[PDB]
Every structure is written in structure tokens, then in C-alpha cells.
RNA sequence: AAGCUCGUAUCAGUUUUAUGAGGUAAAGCGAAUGAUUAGAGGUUCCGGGGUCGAAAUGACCUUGACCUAUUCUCAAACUUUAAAUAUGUAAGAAGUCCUUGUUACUUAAUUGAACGUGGACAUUUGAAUGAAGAGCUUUUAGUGGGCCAUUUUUGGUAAGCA
RNA sequence: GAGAACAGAAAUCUCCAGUAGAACAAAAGGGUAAAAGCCCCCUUGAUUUUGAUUUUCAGUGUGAAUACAAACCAUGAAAGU
RNA sequence: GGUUGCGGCCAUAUCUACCAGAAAGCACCGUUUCCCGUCCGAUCAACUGUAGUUAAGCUGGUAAGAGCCUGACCGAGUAGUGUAGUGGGUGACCAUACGCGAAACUCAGGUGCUGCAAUCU
RNA sequence: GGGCGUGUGGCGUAGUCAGCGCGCUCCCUUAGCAUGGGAGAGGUCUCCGGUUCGAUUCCGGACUCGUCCGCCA
């Protein structure tokens, strides 16, 4: 018959990695999570308690509950034609903070600093990001850079 | 070439007979292998040949391959 | 439980079955198709272990038949008196509840105990009734 | 030829942690010590780290951060001459005095010393520093004995007893103290008090000085050089205890020099690495030497 | 050079394999106990072998470990039993050496008719000072190459002390 | 189908930026596991066949193993490495910063946790593009035999086959 | 791999090398080295009370599992489990 | 800058073979009355810091060293791949257009950094 | 074609990760009525791999027989 267990098809997903097996380092236990933090989920195969299901591997969610050794995380799961709210109790070995959130907060504080310093002059702050604009005019010189003519190479076996 | 051409009839599909630019069953070219074997940095094996490298311990590189260091 | 179900086709020769609430041991099995379209029927010929009677039966192959639990146990004689054997278990337990065999097995066992061999007795349990089937002699540990 | 390791072995080998390779940290014990209840968010967990080397006892109060461990206060046994203890700097009573010193020092620098005076009159009874009402809780600290063996009579528990009588709230039971009867599950207080005041070394001093005098000159030589007899060590432990309860303030040494003054001599003495060009010159000279037909 | 490179006997282990449990095991254990002055330890059988007749875990051998000058004294008695002649094959690559002897009568216990006759295996383990580095729990390390005991050093020590000669084979 | 609450948004089968997760394609085997071709150098208290040997833990060849350095070819249920395409989250007003209120939680401790009071920051309010209105509810029909094409792919010699 | 009477291919003892090439009840795959393996000591948390969550999923049931709360216990020096 | 205690990242830190180590600190080291544990005070426990020693541990250096790490316009815009055509070819498969882009190999360089407290010619 | 069972000394069977029985051949013994005892000589456990402390035993493959089926058109 068919087989769809709780950890089916999780072979390479829950292998550890090359040459970093063994016990886990103490930074994962010394990291501090608060309610509202945004965290990434990546399971550790060395810890069998508090494991996430294989669906939530690589998923990103929001902390809603902090307990003794675990964290409650909220994920949005697509079921059919809508998203449902899923609450997960995961031990802290299987989560880490999302770095995109802290990058955005750094942008917020630097952006507020720019607005605050330029508010003393009113110099059209222009605080929105802009994407890659087309590159403008330039003059390239041939002083020591005379062009070298290239041609297609004929065919050879090369074995 | 005639032996390979006779052997090609026993195979399905299309095969080509190419005269390689390499020396024997090695992977260097003919003048590259010639300018390598004029120095002592090649040394024969049962059918193949072992080559000298600039890496490794100098004691092993001198017990093997003596004629190149005999400069 | 004392007894467990099984399928007729799952049964095979030298196995125990329950026929008419008797522990029986099969000697013959035969399957014949009922009709060309239909399923085969299993004919079973078996012998009661305790009484030796021949009991047969025919069932559908997919039907489930009752199967007993039969345990064979090994003991040493202590005495044969009044038709009741007295046995001695490993770790020193003793039972006298077994009745002596009544046939040529019982006669041979009685003569062997009278002339003084050390006799090893096999007694079987199936469905709450107890009997002795065979005896040997201990070749070592005299 | 026999003790040879392949390149495949050395490539697939995974090294342990550096402290495990040095054999100094049990990470299985460390994880259970330094981790915190996550609902106590940034609350530090404090370890009384007690380590026994030869000629020293090291007591520290240590919390854990990601960048490394942080020490509140440390107390070594080699600063006990300031309090009057000169000999036996690693005995069970020295462990007691070091624990008492680090307890009084931590309560002084936290300001929790006018309350929670600890056991002023010591008798060897088993009790913990209980919480006083309508005020702050006592300072809670947990042992880190490291790789040292737990054993009834070991001096890590003497350091524990000294720290507990100094006013720290350290959780412990009494069944590892000296004087614990195994069959009758109770603690004998007078033998523990004798050990706090050095009875086990003074009784040995008497029972060896009465018969074997060459041993009494080999060991306990410093006791004869400083005229310390068997009975006076009890009162010098008492005076050391009251000196600790007077001032644990930890004046450091004057260092006799500067950091760069030590660094000049040690930088002169340390060996340096060989650069790429002189390494190439060295191997060219070696080729010209042995492979240059002698 | 040589400040504390001096070889010494780490231990002497005396092994008797009676091969089967019971009265012979107790008698061999009594012989080992009276010879050592210590109670001996019996060792269980790892696997069942039909040809030897052994099953798993019947304490088929008995052995004792003696350290110090007493071990040196029993080694003196064993060497005078062996007439201070040992094969070169007896020594090992690590530097440890052993020999096997028949009966304790040559050792001089004298004979009781009950106790029977049992031969012995003597094994001497040799080390230099500083061997605690491997044995201690904290900061366990490996011993350096120069300080290691070897076969040539142990045969030189066995020629110099005990004024014995080794056989060429 | 009936609408209801609102009026340009608590949107988007899309892109960008930042940040994750994956073990397929490829590649690799003088890297682990497994398969596999050929010689070379060694090991015999440590092999087997012959020949010379009284015999010899003898000798000489040969052939097998094991080791060492090489060499040829591979893997859906092998792998150090590792794409492309797909895929999670974020791009603020429900935000940021400052100050100090509550608690029976928590801390050695106004220490922290959560929710707050008061104050400051507004149209470039925090990337692009588009918005056709956005959100919400009730009720009910028919349907629940499918098939074909490109690409990936399984069984099969194959099939207008499954 | 190197040694030690009987004792040899396999009995017991000693040393060295040994990233797991072993073991962890069973099928296979993951995980594990001062351990999750082997040996020893103490125990019954394989307990009580109802909730929440994950998988299968209609976000029904059943099975299995996760993290807590309120008790009462076990163990250890203790953190803890 | 050396050393110790506790660490963080967990080989640039490991492994093999040599060499060196002033001071201090670690270490080996001396002992068995007491607590305690062993067949064995070897490990563990306790006592002395005394009788000694840098021989080892430890630290550092060396090696056209093994390994590991970093980089390259080195291989290679190669293999592979998203999209397109009433493109080629009997087919197997392959070119082109708009895009993304490896691994092995080769070469070059490197061989622990650092937090808290104490202590040192 | 497929399924199921099967194969162990001269013979016949067993089973736990080569045994007995019956024969045999020898040596004794026994008024017997009858004999009895002790020893043997006896096996690639169908075979070959792997598994396992160890395979009859477990498993993969192959072989030998014996059986039962192969329908409705």
C-alpha cells in the first residue's frame, strides 16, 4: 500500500549536513525571542522533541507565545483556495530570527535619521528606494586601450 | 583505422574514427609529452606513467624522479 | 485469549484447528472449485489429539475457522500412583494433576518406571484440558 | 608505516569543539546549566564556577552571553594570605574560606550585604539562605563543578558550604558533605564543623607528629617554619572568617610593570612565522643542497 | 636527555584461564588470592563456543593486577622460575612484555592435594613517569613520541636490571 | 441569484530589493558506500600449484589474496559539491523614537514581559506596475465517466496502449 | 596490529591505532561518542484534571504526536530532566 | 605579548614527523591518617607544595607535508536549464533567438580569531 | 504456464542461531522364556552465496521430485 507517515520523504531534509553533526552550539539556546518576532523554521534532526512537520521547513512566521523551552509560531498555509492560520509549538533549536526583518528595521532607523537631519534644511529628502536605472552617458578613451580585433575560431577535435 | 572500420559494422548508429592529438593513452599533446619526457619528470609504470608535480614533500619528490632534479 | 481465528486457506498441514469444539490436528487438506464461476471449497480431515477420533469438515476458503493454542511442555517423572502422574518442573515446581495415559503409551511408561529409567514426559495443553503424549529417556545428566 | 592516516580519513574527519578537544568543558552539562526559561527573557543565570588546580582554588560567578561568558566577581585561594591563611591553600577548609570570600564579595558589590548576613555563627548544620519577607530575594547561584567527580567528602562541596554560609542562596542537599552517614540518612554536624575548622588536618598533624617525625619534617615543614601548631589553625580559620566578613573588597596587585613592559620581553621571546619569499628561498637552497648532487 | 625518563613497572597482571566454571575456578582464584595478597577478579565469557564448551557469561577466567614493589617481587619469583631467560618474541612493539609459566610449585607455594595444579600467565606493563596524561579525566592527552616506551628500551632495561639475557629467537 | 457595509482600500496566478529553505538536472569516484578494467611495487611465523630439493616457518618461478601509488568505466532506491524553473517572508500609521502607569507574572533588584497615558515624526508615508471598485454574508442549481497537444516522466518491444 | 602456559582461526589478559566503519527489540531511512551506545545505583511521570496545537483532513472522527497550566512524585550536589 | 579560569565561532583551530620554550602559571610530581572508591590510592577521594622536572602534557615554530579555508576573466559563459519558431533531421537528437548559469580541474594565497576576569619580567 | 509442498548417513525421520531410531559391523553377555549390553562404521543436513557468535535452522538465487490447477466463449 501507500505510505504517508509523519516523517515520510524526509530523508535528505532531516539529514544533518556534512561534518557538522553532533551536539548543537549554545548560541541557539542563548538567543532570545519575543512576541511579534519574525522567525525562519529549519528543523534540526539531532533534536527529536518539538520537531516541525515537513511542510513548515523553510517557512517564515510570527511568534505569538513564549514558553519554557519552545516558541509558538503562526504560519499561513494554503488549503484549497484560501490560507488558514496554523499555530506551531517548536523548540528553539528549530528556529532562528529572520535577517530581512532586521535589515528593514536598519533601513527604518537610517531613513528616520536622514529625514531628521534633512528636516533642518528642507532639501527634498527623496526617501523612497529606486530600482536600477539605465546607465547614463559616458566617454570611453583609447589611450593605452586601442581595440583588439577578434574573429571566430575554426573547428578542432580536442580529444 | 581499417580494424576500427571493420569493427564499426557490428554497432548500431553512427561512429567516427578520429586520430587523436594525444600521446598514447595519456592526456597531454605530442609535443607537450615530448618536452615533458626529455626532462626526468615522467617515470614509467606497468603500462601508464606517473608525472611530477610542484606540490608535496621534497624528500618523496627526490626519491622518486631523480633525473629532473639532476639538473 | 485461549483461541484465535484464522482463514481456511491460511491453514496448512500439521496445524491445529477447532472442529466441533475439539482441538484437532490436520492430516488432510483438499480444495475443489464449487462451480466453474465460484470459489473453491476446503475439505479438512483432522485427528483429535486427545481422543484420536477422525473429524472432517468442508467450508468456504474465505471462511474463518477457530484455532487453539497448543503448548507442549517438558517434565521429569517423580511417581506414578493411582493413575495420576507426578511431575517436576524446571525451578523445582511440582504438579500431580496430570492423569496417567491409558493406552500402550501408558503401559510402556508404567513398565519403564517399574524397571527404573529416568523418564522425560511431554504433556500438551489445549483449551483447558491436559494430557501426556510421549516419553523419552535422558541420555546425559543421569 | 603503521600509524598512517589517509587523505580520505583526514577529509571526512569532523573535529569536536575546541574546549572538548582540550578536555575542559562538558557541553552536555553546560547546556543544562546556562540555558534559561525563555519566558524569563534576558534574565542571566549565574554559576558559581569552582575549579581545583594544584596550589590554587578558583571560584568565579559567571553568566553567559553570546560573545562570551561574563564574570561578576572572582576569588582565588592565593589571596588568602591577605586574610591570614598561609598554608594548605587547597584543603577542604581553604575551599570553604574561598567560598565564603566570594559570597561576601558578591553581596557587597551587589549591595545585598546589609541584609542576608548568612551564617554568622557557624556550627555545621545544613540549611539554606531563606528569603526574608517584604524585601529582595537572596542571590541565587548554581554550581559548575565541571568534569570533577561528585563524591561524599569532595572539596567542591566545601566551596558550596562556604558560599552558602556566606549568604548566597545555592540549592543543595546535604548527602555529599563529610560526615554523612549512608545507612542512617542524616548529617553529622560536629564532623562537618571539625572539617570547616581544619580538624582532619590537625588530627593528622598530631597522630603523625607523635610517632613519625621525618614525615613531620618532610610535610608540614612550613608549619614548623611559621611555628603553627595543631590547635592554633582553628582560631586562624576563625580570624580568617571574621576578616572576610570585615572586608572582601579585593584590592588587586600592583603588577610591578606595565602590559607593554611584559609584552616587550614576551614578544622578544616568542618565535615568529616564516614568510613566503624566505620559504621559497629555503626550498630553493634545499633543492640546491640535496638534489644538487651534494 | 634523561631527568625522568626512567622506565618502571606500571603493573603486573596475572591471568589464569581454567576454561570452565566451578571448583577449578574457585581453586585457581584461591591460588591467585594467596599469591597476590588481594582478592582476584573473575572475567565473563564474551561468546558461546561449542569446541571449548563455553557459553556466554560463566566467569571462565580469573586474573589479578598487582602494582608496586610487591609486583616487582612476584616478577622476581617468576623470572627465577624462568631462569632469567626470555624469548625475543615475548617482548612487544609497545615495550610491554609477558611470559607464561606452568605450576605454582616452582613459585614455591607448596602443594595441597585439594587445590590441584594451575599454570599462570605473567604480563608486565612498562611506562615512564608522566603516564597520568592519558589516564586523567580532565585535559586528557596523548604521550609524545620521544617519551614513549619501546622494545629496544625495554630489552635494554631487562638486560641491565635483573642481570638477564634475552634469547635471539 | 439576492444582496449588505463602505468608497480607492487590511489588494494582485507580476516584477525589483533584502533574506530564507530545497537535494532534482549537472557533476564526482587518484572523496565515503556499492559496482568495476588493467598492469606496477611490496607482504609471507602470513596462501595455492609446479620445478630443484634428504627434508626444512627450504629455494626458484607461477597464480591467488592483502597493502601502497596509479589507471578505464558507472549508480532510481550512492554522494563532498550543486544549478535553472518553481517556493516562504519583509518593503511601516496596526510604524519608529522619547517619557512613565498597571500586575497576583518574572527578576537579586522598577530587572524584564505584555498592554497602556502623554509628546514628536505626514504626503517620496518609505520599491515598480496595475486596480477593472474593496470587503462580507445567505441560499441553491448542475457536476463528481473525461479526452487531446508541447515539455518532464512511469510500466511496456510497441501502440490511435495504460 | 603487536604480545602472554595449556590456548590453536575463534576462550582470558595487556598495549597501540581506531569519526563510528559498532550498538540502539523489529522493516527501512534519519539521529546519537565524557551519548541516545555498554555497565552500575535509585525508582515508577507507563500517575491525576480537563483544555490548546500538528499530521491525515471536510481543517470531521480515529490513531499517533507537540508545548503548556494546575497538582502529586522520581532522580541528581544542582541546573534541570 | 606569555599563562590560567570560564567561554563564542567550532580544523585558517585537525593530523603526521622534528625543534624550541626566559619569567609566571598550568602540568607531571611526593603521601595514605581522615571523607570516599577500586582486584589494584593506576583512575577517583583526601593531605602536603614539601623531595624533584621541563622528559611528557601544554604553547609556539618548521615541512616545494596530508587535510581544511579563501579567491581567480583557471576550466567555462562549458555542462545544465526557463521561454520561442509551420527551425534542421526518417529518427536518435541537434543548432539558433531572448535569459539564467554550475561542479570537477588548474593556479595563487592562508594555517586560528576573539570576549570577560586574574596574573606575569 | 503458474501455484503449493519436497529433498539429512544403509534406511528412516528430527531440530535450537549434525541428532537419534532401525539396520549394519565388531566385542562381550545370556540354561533361558527370550537374548541383552557396549563400542563403532556411517551424513557437502538438495546446492550456492550472504546474514548471524552460530545457520537444518534465517534470507537471496538455483536445482530435484511430488502434487493441484489451466475456465466461459
Swiss-Prot record, chain A:
GO terms for molecular function: structural constituent of ribosome. One of its GO terms (cellular component) is cytosol. It is found in: Cytoplasm. One of its GO terms (biological process) is cytoplasmic translation. There is a cross-link at residue 31 (Glycyl lysine isopeptide (Lys-Gly) (interchain with G-Cter in ubiquitin)). SUPFAM superfamilies: Translation proteins SH3-like domain (SSF50104). The keyword Transcription regulation does not apply. Its main location: cytoplasm. Keywords: Cytoplasm, Isopeptide bond, Ribonucleoprotein, Ribosomal protein, Ubl conjugation. There are 2 genes for eL21 in yeast. Component of the large ribosomal subunit (LSU). Mature yeast ribosomes consist of a small (40S) and a large (60S) subunit. The 40S small subunit contains 1 molecule of ribosomal RNA (18S rRNA) and 33 different proteins (encoded by 57 genes). The large 60S subunit contains 3 rRNA molecules (25S, 5.8S and 5S rRNA) and 46 different proteins (encoded by 81 genes). Belongs to the eukaryotic ribosomal protein eL21 family. Component of the ribosome, a large ribonucleoprotein complex responsible for the synthesis of proteins in the cell. The small ribosomal subunit (SSU) binds messenger RNAs (mRNAs) and translates the encoded message by selecting cognate aminoacyl-transfer RNA (tRNA) molecules. The large subunit (LSU) contains the ribosomal catalytic site termed the peptidyl transferase center (PTC), which catalyzes the formation of peptide bonds, thereby polymerizing the amino acids delivered by tRNAs into a polypeptide chain. This is Large ribosomal subunit protein eL21A. The gene is RPL21A.
From Swiss-Prot, chain C:
GO terms for molecular function: ribosome binding; RNA binding; translation elongation factor activity; translation initiation factor activity. The modification Hypusine is found at residue 36. Coiled coil: none annotated. Changing residue 101 to L: Temperature-sensitive growth phenotype. Lethal. Changing residue 48 to V: Impairs programmed ribosomal frameshifting. Lys-36 undergoes hypusination, a unique post-translational modification that consists in the addition of a butylamino group from spermidine to lysine side chain, leading to the formation of the unusual amino acid hypusine. eIF-5As are the only known proteins to undergo this modification, which is essential for their function. SUPFAM superfamilies: Nucleic acid-binding proteins, Translation proteins SH3-like domain. There is a cross-link at residue 71 (Glycyl lysine isopeptide (Lys-Gly) (interchain with G-Cter in ubiquitin)). Changing residue 103 to V: Temperature-sensitive growth phenotype. The keyword Ubl conjugation applies. Changing residue 125 to F: Temperature-sensitive growth phenotype. Lethal. InterPro entries: IF5A-like, IF5A-like_N, NA-bd_OB-fold, Rib_uL2_dom2, Trans_elong_IF5A_hypusine_site, Transl_elong_IF5A_C, Translation_prot_SH3-like_sf. Changing residue 7 to H: Temperature-sensitive growth phenotype. Reduced binding to the ribosome. Changing residue 41 to A: Temperature-sensitive growth phenotype. Reduced binding to the ribosome. It comes from the Eukaryota. It is found in: Cytoplasm. Induction: Expressed in aerobic conditions. Changing residue 68 to S/L: Temperature-sensitive growth phenotype. Lethal. The modification Phosphoserine is found at residue 59. One of its GO terms (biological process) is positive regulation of translational termination. Keywords: Acetylation, Cytoplasm, Elongation factor, Hypusine, Isopeptide bond, Phosphoprotein, Protein biosynthesis, RNA-binding, Ubl conjugation. There are two genes for eIF-5A in yeast. NCBIfam families: eIF_5A (TIGR00037). Belongs to the eIF-5A family. This is Eukaryotic translation initiation factor 5A-1. The lineage of its organism: Eukaryota, Fungi, Dikarya, Ascomycota, Saccharomycotina. The gene is HYP2.
Amino acid at each position: 500500500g501507500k505510505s504517508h507517515g509523519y516523517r515520510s520523504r524526509t530523508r535528505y531534509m532531516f539529514q544533518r549536513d556534512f561534518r557538522k553533526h553532533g551536539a548543537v552550539h549554545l548560541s541557539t539556546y542563548l538567543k532570545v525571542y519575543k512576541v511579534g518576532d519574525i522567525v525562519d523554521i529549519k528543523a534540526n534532526g539531532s533534536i527529536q522533541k518539538g520537531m516541525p512537520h515537513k511542510f513548515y521547513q523553510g517557512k517564515t512566521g510570527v511568534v505569538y507565545n513564549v514558553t519554557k523551552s519552545s516558541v509558538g509560531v503562526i504560519i499561513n498555509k494554503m488549503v484549497g483556495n484560501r490560507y488558514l492560520e496554523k499555530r506551531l509549538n517548536l523548540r528553539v533549536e528549530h528556529i532562528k530570527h529572520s535577517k530581512c526583518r532586521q535589515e528593514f528595521l536598519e533601513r527604518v532607523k537610517a531613513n528616520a535619521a536622514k529625514r531628521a537631519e534633512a528636516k533642518a534644511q528642507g532639501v527634498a529628502v527623496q526617501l523612497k528606494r529606486q530600482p536600477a536605472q539605465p546607465r547614463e552617458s559616458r566617454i570611453v578613451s583609447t589611450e593605452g586601450n586601442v581595440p583588439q580585433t577578434l574573429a571566430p575560431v575554426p573547428y578542432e577535435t580536442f580529444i | 583505422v581499417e580494424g576500427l572500420r571493420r569493427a564499426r559494422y557490428k554497432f548500431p548508429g553512427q561512429q567516427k574514427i578520429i586520430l587523436s592529438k594525444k600521446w598514447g593513452f595519456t592526456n597531454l599533446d605530442r609535443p607537450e609529452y615530448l618536452k615533458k619526457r626529455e626532462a626526468g619528470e615522467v617515470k614509467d609504470d606497468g603500462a601508464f606513467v606517473k608525472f611530477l608535480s610542484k606540490k608535496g614533500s621534497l624528500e618523496n619528490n627526490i626519491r622518486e624522479f631523480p633525473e629532473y632534479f639532476a639538473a | 485469549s485461549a483461541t484465535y481465528p484464522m482463514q481456511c486457506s491460511a491453514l496448512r498441514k500439521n496445524g491445529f484447528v477447532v472442529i466441533k469444539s475439539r482441538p484437532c490436528k490436520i492430516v488432510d487438506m483438499s480444495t475443489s472449485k464449487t462451480g466453474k464461476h465460484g470459489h473453491a471449497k476446503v475439505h479438512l480431515v483432522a485427528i483429535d489429539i486427545f481422543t484420536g477420533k477422525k473429524l472432517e469438515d468442508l467450508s468456504p476458503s474465505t471462511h474463518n475457522m477457530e484455532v487453539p493454542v497448543v503448548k507442549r511442555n517438558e517434565y521429569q517423572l517423580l511417581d506414578i500412583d493411582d493413575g495420576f502422574l507426578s511431575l517436576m518442573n524446571m525451578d523445582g515446581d511440582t504438579k500431580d494433576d496430570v492423569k496417567a495415559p491409558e493406552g500402550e503409551l501408558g503401559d510402556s511408561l508404567q513398565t519403564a518406571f517399574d524397571e527404573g529409567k529416568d523418564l522425560m514426559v511431554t504433556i500438551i495443553s489445549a483449551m483447558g484440558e491436559e494430557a501426556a503424549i510421549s516419553f523419552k529417556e535422558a541420555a546425559r545428566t543421569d | 608505516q603503521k600509524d598512517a592516516k589517509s587523505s580520505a580519513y583526514s577529509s571526512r574527519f569532523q573535529t569536536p569543539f575546541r574546549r572538548r578537544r582540550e578536555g575542559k568543558t562538558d557541553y552536555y552539562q553546560r547546556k543544562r546549566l546556562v540555558t534559561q526559561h525563555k519566558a524569563k527573557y534576558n534574565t542571566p543565570k549565574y554559576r558559581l564556577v569552582v575549579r581545583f588546580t594544584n596550589k590554587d582554588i578558583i571560584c568565579q560567578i559567571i553568566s553567559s552571553t553570546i560573545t562570551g561568558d561574563v564574570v561578576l566577581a572572582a576569588a582565588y585561594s592565593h589571596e588568602l594570605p591577605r586574610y591570614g591563611i598561609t598554608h594548605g591553600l587547597t584543603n577542604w577548609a581553604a575551599a570553604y574560606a574561598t567560598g565564603l570570600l566570594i559570597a561576601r564579595r558578591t553581596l557587597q558589590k551587589l549591595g545585598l550585604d546589609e541584609t542576608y548576613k548568612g551564617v554568622e555563627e557557624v556550627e555545621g548544620e545544613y540549611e539554606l539562605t531563606e528569603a526574608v519577607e517584604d524585601g529582595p530575594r537572596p542571590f541565587k547561584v548554581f554550581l559548575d563543578i565541571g568534569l570533577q567527580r561528585t563524591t561524599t567528602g569532595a572539596r567542591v562541596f566545601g566551596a558550596l558550604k562556604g558560599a552558602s554560609d556566606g549568604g548566597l542562596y545555592v540549592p543543595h542537599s546535604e548527602n555529599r558533605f563529610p560526615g554523612w552517614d549512608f545507612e542512617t540518612e542524616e548529617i553529622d554536624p560536629e564532623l562537618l564543623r571539625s572539617y570547616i575548622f581544619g580538624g582532619h588536618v590537625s588530627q593528622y598533624m598530631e597522630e603523625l607528629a607523635d610517632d613519625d617525625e621525618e614525615r613531620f619534617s618532610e610535610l608540614f615543614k612550613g608549619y614548623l617554619a611559621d611555628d603553627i601548631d595543631a590547635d592554633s589553625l582553628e582560631d586562624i580559620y576563625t580570624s580568617a572568617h571574621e576578616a572576610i566578613r570585615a572586608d572582601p573588597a579585593f584590592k588587586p596587585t600592583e603588577k610591578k610593570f606595565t602590559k607593554e613592559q611584559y609584552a616587550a620581553e614576551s614578544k622578544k621571546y616568542r618565535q615568529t612565522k616564516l614568510s613566503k619569499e624566505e620559504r621559497a628561498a629555503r626550498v630553493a637552497a634545499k633543492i640546491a643542497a640535496l638534489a644538487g648532487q651534494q | 636527555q634523561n631527568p625522568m625518563r626512567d622506565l618502571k613497572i606500571e603493573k603486573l597482571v596475572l591471568n589464569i584461564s581454567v576454561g570452565e566454571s566451578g571448583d577449578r575456578l574457585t581453586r585457581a582464584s584461591k591460588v591467585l588470592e594467596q599469591l597476590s595478597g588481594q582478592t582476584p577478579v573473575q572475567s565473563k565469557a564474551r561468546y558461546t563456543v561449542r569446541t571449548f564448551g563455553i557459553r556466554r557469561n560463566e566467569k571462565i577466567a580469573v586474573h589479578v593486577t598487582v602494582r608496586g614493589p610487591k609486583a616487582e617481587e612476584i616478577l622476581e619469583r617468576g623470572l627465577k622460575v624462568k631462569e632469567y631467560q626470555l624469548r625475543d618474541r615475548n617482548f612487544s612493539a609497545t615495550g610491554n612484555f609477558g611470559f607464561g609459566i606452568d605450576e605454582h610449585i616452582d613459585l614455591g607455594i607448596k602443594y595441597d592435594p585439594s587445590i590441584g595444579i594451575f599454570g599462570m600467565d605473567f604480563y608486565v606493563v612498562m611506562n615512564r613517569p608522566g603516564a597520568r596524561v592519558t589516564r586523567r579525566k580532565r585535559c586528557k592527552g596523548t604521550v609524545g613520541n620521544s617519551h614513549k616506551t619501546t622494545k629496544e628500551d625495554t630489552v635494554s632495561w631487562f638486560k641491565q636490571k635483573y642481570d638477564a639475557d634475552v634469547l635471539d629467537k
